[PDB]
């Protein structure tokens, strides 16, 4: 992610099965879905910075809460 | 410290249960040196605020550093507008 | 003229009872804490079950007299980590007051589980981020 | 006088008497060893400057200096084996090679980019660089040792030293490994750059404009550190730690003294600068808080 | 025999014995009870033996 | 022309100040009486000559003990070993190693009167009274302590002149089973030579 | 202007009830 | 006489449990002689104050000649600075 | 010792172990160390003296009085 600019817009790709590479949790809500360790990383950065994270799919809004989960 | 004395005024003014100072300044010298300034930053204007005794169970710091700012217009270094504290709460009932 | 250098404001023989009172106390405090460390030195430290981390270093001062779950979910909430709970909350609340200033939230958490004793425990995953308090299972 | 290129090197094989202080002036190649041998000196270069150059030994000292003017010679190498060294200076921007030279006491003066390499336990107390110039002593033993820097050379140490004084007026840079010292007083004025790794029971870190003083992993019982005007410190106390920033100056203390005590004057600045993840991260205590 | 850092540099490690021996580990070696070093840690100051257990500075 | 927090350890300047305030008073006031150059320039030595006295006084060694007095410091000169004992209830933040920094009158009176002596040999010594542990006590004092120095040695006081101890509630010079003299026993004592 | 603490303890007797108070919740966490 | 009745005066205004008078002087003759006089000295200064009688259960007397001055000027007999008796005492509550 | 200039400073080296040579014990505070005859003798009379006879190591005090014990 692009963490400061102004509006610290980004993306993350989420993997829904747990694959070896993407086996971290998200917790979009109540849906969630598995990443990589540097995006759970930026996200529990994102986290920090108290930034709201909600999950999009086709650029439709899903779930607004993005909690990591067991690694 | 007058201003923080008015800033103490008004937190004094509200009941509530848990107050949070925040730090956010420009980049200088690297993250770490950004975060560790933030945070004492916060420390001590926290300090102040809780010896200007205030109704806050909980007064909560931290500093991002230069994480989260609100600005597109970054020039500047603590005159720059997104170097900044937040004091944030909610009035209780 | 004369004078020697600590001229403080005018004290009341209330807070002078109390005062001998408190020092006493305390003497007394000192002497059992002193002799049940003989008896039994401790072992482990609960920095094992709360380890430090990232974000758990943010800082807070603290002033509670009440239930323990509340505070914790508090600190837990500051802390960016999701609070989970174990075991049935006794009948009897599991009071904590905790007045501490400008302390880093393991500490508090610390604190907290070191006060709490035999009734509940803290503990903390930091992978996992999680905050987990769990009541004893006396009863 | 005429030009040295035209001609191969020779051997050539010259006696020299017992000697303790070595002066060298001039671009050259010297080397020094200790052995068995009697004291000895062989020049290998061109077979015209075998004469210019001059082996004069007087009252102790050995003067290897240009002679009878300094046309050109800069490939000539003089090997000397010798038992006896107790001083070394070099001037004229050359290759010195030295190992095994044990001691009890010396001096290294040197001068103008002399590229020098020492690879023995060179016990010293007393160091001097003009500046410009490469040092790397890899062994050293001392009870007592003292840097003066004036100019901007480039000089790293290796070995235990119990440092005691260290004073920086140009900007040159500085490196120790390992240093076991009582009271350190390190006095840096012009963008001088010093690193000391070791223990030290009494630091007093004095630095007065861009000056870097990167003591971390220098354990001081005890710390004096007074920045100025846009300096660097780099602290990591153990006991009881006093600093002062003075203004645009930057102390990082990167260990938590059971005792701390910084100010700040004008817009200097006092950091923590710790991992905040490592997992036996102390906190402040009721004698540690001290809010900047 | 217990061990405690003395000082650390990135690269090795100056360690002092439980009755004051000095010593110095490379970034791998050998010491007695512990036997071989595998990693040294500057800005945390521990170094991982194969024993499974870690050395640190000494209060 | 004064920083409230101890000037930026800067040198500080009544003596300058005030001579210049002096001056303007008397230079204003001779070319009100006279409307000319002659009594201006009369005015203005008058000024200087009224300035340099006051500051003679002002900056007295018996001043500074008086107002060290008037706040709550205390001065004991026994032969050549000066003492000045200043309370940490009032000079150090509640149980604490802060330096009370709404205090800077006293800490600054007291840097200037060890400037009369260039050459001491200054040990700051720290006391608390008998509550608390037998740890707690030594490792505060020896904070408070701590604490002073710095200040002192931040003040324009070289390291070596300095030492810095703290004592428990081993020496006394007040009975801690009493109120006001635990209170008395709660204190910092700068000595020098 | 700087203020003192609000609850600062000003007294003879009030700063001796509050480093009873300190060492009394020491010897708490202690135990 | 007149200082010691005013000495003894100002002692009987506090109530007091120990009394210490010592003598230091200057150094004259040997060790064993200026601890001689000072012991003396303190014997008989102790005495005219108890006479003067002081509300004081215990007057320890004491002289250690000359170990341990108050000054660096120590020329002069008993004219030095540093060759002096000292009252100490504490006053009981 | 010098024991009367005007500030009567002077040194005590001690040796923790107990021997033959220094073998009379201090008590600095709750810290103990072994001396020998003249210094137990000079020490003995700087109590008297009544001066503070702090133990200090590499120039930092560990603890306040000092008594003299069995010899």
Redesign the interface.
Known sequence: CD????R?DCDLPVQVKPSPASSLLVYCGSSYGYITKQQYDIL??Y?????NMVLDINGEYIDSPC????? | YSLLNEIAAFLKQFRKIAITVTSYSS?YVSVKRERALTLARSRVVSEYLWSQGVDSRIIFTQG?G???????Y?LGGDRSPNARVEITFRRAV | KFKKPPINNPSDDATIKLAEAAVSVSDSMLEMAKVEKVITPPSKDNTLTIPNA??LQARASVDWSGPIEELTARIAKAA?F?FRVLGKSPSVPVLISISTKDESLAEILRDIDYQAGKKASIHVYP???VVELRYAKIY | EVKKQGTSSTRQFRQVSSFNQIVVQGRLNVNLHTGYNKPEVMLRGDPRDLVQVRTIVKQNTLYVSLGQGYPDYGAVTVDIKTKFLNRFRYEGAGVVTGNNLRTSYLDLYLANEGTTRLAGNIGLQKLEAVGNGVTQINGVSSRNLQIVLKGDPKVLISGFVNLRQLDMYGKGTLSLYWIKSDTLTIRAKKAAKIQLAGIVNRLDVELWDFAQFKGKYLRAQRSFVKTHDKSVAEISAVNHQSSLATDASDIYYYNLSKTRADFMAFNGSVLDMREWGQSDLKDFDRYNKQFP | IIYYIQAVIPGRAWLIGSNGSTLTVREGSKIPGYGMVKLIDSLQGRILTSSGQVIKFSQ | CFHPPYNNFQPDRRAVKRVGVDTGIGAVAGAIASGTASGTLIGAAAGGTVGLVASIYRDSKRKIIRDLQKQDIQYVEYGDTRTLIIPTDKYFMFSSPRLNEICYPGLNNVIRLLNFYPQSTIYVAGFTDNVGSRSHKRKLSQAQAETMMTFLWANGIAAKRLKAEGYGDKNAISDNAIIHGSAQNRRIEIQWF
């Open positions: 963490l400061t600019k102004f610290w529990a950065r986290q920090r910075a108290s930034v909690i990591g989960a067991e690694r | 980049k991002l230069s994480d989260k700012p609100i600005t597109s970054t | 990232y974000n960016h999701r992978n996992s981020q």
